[PDB]
Amino acid sequence: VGNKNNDKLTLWTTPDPSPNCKVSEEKDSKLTLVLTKCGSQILASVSLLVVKGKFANINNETNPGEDYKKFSVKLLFDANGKLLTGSSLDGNYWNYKNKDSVIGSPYENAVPFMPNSTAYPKIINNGTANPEDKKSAAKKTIVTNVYLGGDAGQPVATTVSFNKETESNCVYSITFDFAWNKTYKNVPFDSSSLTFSYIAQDAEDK
Amino acid sequence: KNNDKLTLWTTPDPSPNCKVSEEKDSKLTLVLTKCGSQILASVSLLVVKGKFANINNETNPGEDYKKFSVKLLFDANGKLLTGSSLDGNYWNYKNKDSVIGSPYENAVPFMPNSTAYPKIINNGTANPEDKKSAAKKTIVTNVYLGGDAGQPVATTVSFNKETESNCVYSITFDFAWNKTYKNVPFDSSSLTFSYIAQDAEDKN
Amino acid sequence: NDKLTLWTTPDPSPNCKVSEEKDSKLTLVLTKCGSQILASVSLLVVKGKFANINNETNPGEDYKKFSVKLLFDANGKLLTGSSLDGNYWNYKNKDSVIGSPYENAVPFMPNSTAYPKIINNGTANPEDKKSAAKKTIVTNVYLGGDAGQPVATTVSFNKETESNCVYSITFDFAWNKTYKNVPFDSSSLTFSYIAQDAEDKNE
Ligand SMILES: N[C@@H](CCC(=O)O)C(=O)O
Numbered sequence: 001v002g003n004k005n006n007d008k009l010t011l012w013t014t015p016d017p018s019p020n021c022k023v024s025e026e027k028d029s030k031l032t033l034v035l036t037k038c039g040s041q042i043l044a045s046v047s048l049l050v051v052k053g054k055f056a057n058i059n060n061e062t063n064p065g066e067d068y069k070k071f072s073v074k075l076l077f078d079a080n081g082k083l084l085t086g087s088s089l090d091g092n093y094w095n096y097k098n099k100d101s102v103i104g105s106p107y108e109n110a111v112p113f114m115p116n117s118t119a120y121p122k123i124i125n126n127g128t129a130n131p132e133d134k135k136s137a138a139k140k141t142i143v144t145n146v147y148l149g150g151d152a153g154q155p156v157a158t159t160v161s162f163n164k165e166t167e168s169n170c171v172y173s174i175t176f177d178f179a180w181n182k183t184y185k186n187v188p189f190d191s192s193s194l195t196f197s198y199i200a201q202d203a204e205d206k
Numbered sequence: 207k208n209n210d211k212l213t214l215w216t217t218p219d220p221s222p223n224c225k226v227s228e229e230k231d232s233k234l235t236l237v238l239t240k241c242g243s244q245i246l247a248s249v250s251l252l253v254v255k256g257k258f259a260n261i262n263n264e265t266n267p268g269e270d271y272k273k274f275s276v277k278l279l280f281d282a283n284g285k286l287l288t289g290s291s292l293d294g295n296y297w298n299y300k301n302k303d304s305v306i307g308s309p310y311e312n313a314v315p316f317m318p319n320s321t322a323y324p325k326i327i328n329n330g331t332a333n334p335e336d337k338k339s340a341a342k343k344t345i346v347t348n349v350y351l352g353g354d355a356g357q358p359v360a361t362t363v364s365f366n367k368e369t370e371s372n373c374v375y376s377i378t379f380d381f382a383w384n385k386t387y388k389n390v391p392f393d394s395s396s397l398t399f400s401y402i403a404q405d406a407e408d409k410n
Numbered sequence: 411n412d413k414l415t416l417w418t419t420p421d422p423s424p425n426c427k428v429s430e431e432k433d434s435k436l437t438l439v440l441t442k443c444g445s446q447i448l449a450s451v452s453l454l455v456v457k458g459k460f461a462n463i464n465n466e467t468n469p470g471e472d473y474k475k476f477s478v479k480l481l482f483d484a485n486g487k488l489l490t491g492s493s494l495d496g497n498y499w500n501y502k503n504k505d506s507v508i509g510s511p512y513e514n515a516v517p518f519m520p521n522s523t524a525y526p527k528i529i530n531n532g533t534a535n536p537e538d539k540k541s542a543a544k545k546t547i548v549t550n551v552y553l554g555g556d557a558g559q560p561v562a563t564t565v566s567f568n569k570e571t572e573s574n575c576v577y578s579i580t581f582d583f584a585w586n587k588t589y590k591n592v593p594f595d596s597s598s599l600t601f602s603y604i605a606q607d608a609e610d611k612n613e
Contacts, residue, residue, distance in 0.1 A: 005610075010445035015524035015604050019537050027537075032524065032544060034604050036446040038246055040213035040300055041239045043446050045602055047544040051536040097445055099607055100523040118303050119218035119235065132222075132254045138393040139235060139250040141353030150546025152562040152584070157355040179355070190543040192564075195602040197248050197398040199218050199237055202208075202302055243415035243502055244441045244448050321505045322420035322437065334456035335424050335432075341595040342437060342452040344555025360557045382557075400450050400600040402420050402439055405504055410411075 001104045010097035011035040011113045013089070020090045023071050023189070024053040031073060031089055032193075035113050041197045042113055046160075046176065047146075048073065050189040058148075060183040070179035076170035081110030081201075086168040114172040114201040115140075115162030122163050140164055142198075146178070146191040154187055156180045162198050172201070213300035214238040214316045216292070223293045226274050226392070227256035234276060234292055235396075238316050244400045245316055249363075249379065251276065251349075253392040261351075263386040273382035279373035284313030284404075287371040317375040317404040318343075318365035325366050325374075343367060345401075349381070349394040357390055359383050365401050375404070415502035416440040416518045418494065427493045428476050428594070429458035436478060436494055437598075440518050446602045447518055451565075451581065453478065455594040463553075465588040475584035481575035486515030486606075491573040519577040519606040520545075520567030527568045527576070545569055547603075551583075551596040559592055561585050567603050577606070 012034040013020055019027035029050040036043040050056050060068055076084040083091040095102035096110075120140040128134075140162045148154035157179045165173035178191075215237040216223055222230035232253040239246040253259050263272060279287040286294040298305035299313075323343040329336075343365045351357035360382045368376035381392075417439040418425055424432035434455040441448040455461050465474055481489040488496040500507035501515075529540035545567045553559035562584045570578035583594070 007444060012445070015521050016526075030541070032541075034445055036443050036602075038239050038241050038443045038448075039210060040215065040237055041246055041248060043241075043246060043443050043448065043602055045446060045604055047541060049539065049541040049544065051539050056536070100521070116218050116303075121219075130254075134252075134254065136233070136235075136250060136252045136393050138351065138353040138395045139252065141350070141395040142398070143348075143350035143353055143355050143395040145548075147546070147548035148543065150543040150548050150564060150566070152548050152564065159353060159355065161353070190541050192543050192546040192548040193603070195398065195547070195600065197239075197246055198396070199248060241441050241443045241448050242411040243417065243439055244450060246443075246448060319420050319505070324421075334461065337435075337454065337456045338421075339435065339437070339452055339454040339595055341551075341553065341555040341597045342454070344552070344597045345600070346552035346555055346557050346597045362555060362557070364555070398600065400448055401598070402437075402450055405411075410504065 003098050003104065006096055006098040006103040008096050009037045011095070011110050012097055014093050014102060015100055017093055019051055020093055021048070021073060022088045023050050023055050023073065027090070028053040028056070033089070037112060037200065040200060042200050044196050044198070045193055046196070047193045048176070048178075048189065048191045055189040058184040058187045058189060061185050064183075069181070070177070072178075073176040074165055074167065075174045076165055076168050077110075077114055077172040079171045080108065081114050081172065082107070084168040084170055111201050112203050115174065116199040116201050117163065119199040120162035122166065142196050144194060146194050148184070148187050149190055150192045154182070154184065156191065158194060160196050207301065209299055209301040209306040211299050212240045214298070214313050215300055217296050217304055220296055222254055223296055224251070224276060225291045226253050226258050226276065230293070231256040231259070236292070240315060240403065243403055245403050247399050247401070248396050249399070250396045251379070251381075251392065251394045258392040261387040261390045261392060264388055267386070272384070273380070275381070276379040277368055277370065278377040279368055279371050280313075280317055280375040282374050283311065284317045284375065285310070287373055289371040314404050315406050318377065319402040319404050320366065320375075322402040323365035325369065345399050347397065347399075349397050351387070351390050352393055353395045357385070357387065359394065361397060363399050412502050414442045416500070416515050417502055419498050419507060420505055422498055424456055425495050425498055426453070426478060428455050428460050428478065432495070433458040433461070438494070442517060442605065445605055447605050449601050449603070450598050451601070452598045453581070453583070453594065453596045460594040463589040463592045463594060466590050469588070474586070475582070477583075478581040479570055479572070480579040481570055481573050482519055482577040484576045485513065486519045486577065487512070489573040489575055516606050517608050520579065521604040521606050522568065522577075524604040525567035527571065547601050549599065551599050553589070553592050554595055555597045559587070559589065561596065563596075563599060565601050
């Protein structure tokens with residue numbers, strides 16, 4: 001209920017979260033996500049440690065199926081930038097920064113942290129596959145690798161997508177898709193930190 | 207009014223604004239955000255007509271159909287020069303999802319640092335201690351066509367590499383691929399990068 | 411722009427030890443964007459073992475990797491065991507450094523909570539498990555800015571204990587290719603990390 005130390009320029013999970021995320025089951029993972037506002041862009045840092053279930057100890061020798069070689073983590077946001085319930089991330093410690101924790105009250109508005117609707121539109125598809133007015137599927141996308149245990153020999157194909165989701169009537173979204181072709185033998189899903197940026201939505205006029 | 211001199215951009219949803227093969231054959235979305243001593247940049251390229259709108263290296267083998275470059279040339283004041291791939295009409299400081307009413311006079315603080323990224327590196331028989339870095343002017347990475355991890359494109363961002371139109375600063379995007387792509391539009395995933403900024407003139 | 415940048419200078423003299431004293435130029439710029447540091451790093455080695463890599467004539471594993479460490483004290487000052495010399499490691503003034511050594515750069519240090527110095531999980535319950543990998547960024551830089559000359563690059567935060575350091579930034583470089591007369595001249599790498607907060611002043 002009010003502090004001098006709360007910065008509305010950082011929206012985060014806290015830097016050292018308790019289990020806060022669903023990969024396979026409730027609270028089976030720690031998502032560390034920091035969104036820092038640098039004006040027109042968000043500067044983001046993401047790492048995922050899964051602490052129990054299917055992906056806490058990957059073994060594709062003993063679990064060869066394709067459902068054991070990929071998963072997705074979704075953040076769904078409403079018109080005001082609030083986290084919606086169908087999200088992978090629990091909202092309890094998803095809030096503006098105060099020291100190494102969150103502000104006293106849940107945030108009302110985080111639109112300026114949302115991926116820009118104009119740059120990253122949710123998309124309409126009829127007929128005209130190309131009148132040369134065609135809009136970019138890929139632009140909403142960052143494609144890279146993270147590395148399990150910070151080992152360069154354990155890559156995981158990582159796709160960050162902006163405003164790709166429609167679930168729970170969301171207006172904005174950030175999706176992390178992880179997938180690997182290597183057949184990993186007893187490798188915890190513990191991802192190296194990934195820096196990325198996206199163009200920010202502006203605050204509403206009045 | 208709402209005009210933000212901490213962002214220099216193409217607008218987030220540009221009309222065709224770029225030449226890859228021919229005039230206005232592509233949409234370059236480039237956002238430069240000033241974070242003091244560094245520029246934070248996001249770039250994506252959609253080509254909407256010509257050679258690279260639908261890559262088919264089965265029907266177009268050989269290497270002029272497997273690479274191209276996009277150049278931004280800047281003068282002493284950071285203004286976009288005419289030989290640039292990018293058209294300057296909607297290259298300007300931000301105003302609420304568009305550009306400011308008038309063309310900018312100065313964007314030096316957005317330019318790649320001359321000291322960090324000197325125009326000409328040629329280390330002679332110079333002493334080791336005096337040697338300058340060719341690679342430092344360079345970022346080497348991949349973007350992915352259609353946001354598909356199986357469609358990589360070797361991407362080099364180069365700073366102050368260009369001499370064209372007697373430019374003092376430049377940003378170059380070189381794209382190339384070895385995969386023989388069958389009907390893949392050049393529609394690149396977004397690339398985040400940073401570079402060291404030139405200081406403002408005089409009393410900075 | 412000035413107390414918000416901690417750097418090597420953009421065009422440094424030899425300032426770094428890879429094999430021997432002042433055998434390399436580390437360009438490191440740390441820019442404060444509030445809760446995160448925005449970083450650019452590039453390494454040119456100008457003499458010794460790694461100035462002209464030849465793994466045909468020097469096949470051993472000690473010729474195919476090396477590490478560059480920055481060790482920091484409680485106040486964020488560079489400690490002497492560091493690879494980087496502290497003479498031109500300071501807050502920015504134009505394309506150079508301030509007249510006097512800095513007293514405090516805690517707000518540039520990698521967050522202790524996000525990147526704990528010792529965090530090992532013998533007799534830890536799942537919920538209490540701490541991440542080795544989170545302290546890590548793993549990527550490639552490219553020698554000469556050539557896409558055919560990759561170097562596996564790991565940036566690690568608060569991994570070092572040397573000289574009783576409180577914070578650290580480590581650059582590990584390694585390659586499997588057998589390079590024949592390739593100077594170690596790395597392409598620039600952008601990265602960010604979560605920043606330590608300034609300590610509470612007047613309570
Ligand atoms: N270097 C500028 C900075 C302007 C400011 O910080 O307001 C000046 O003092 O002229």
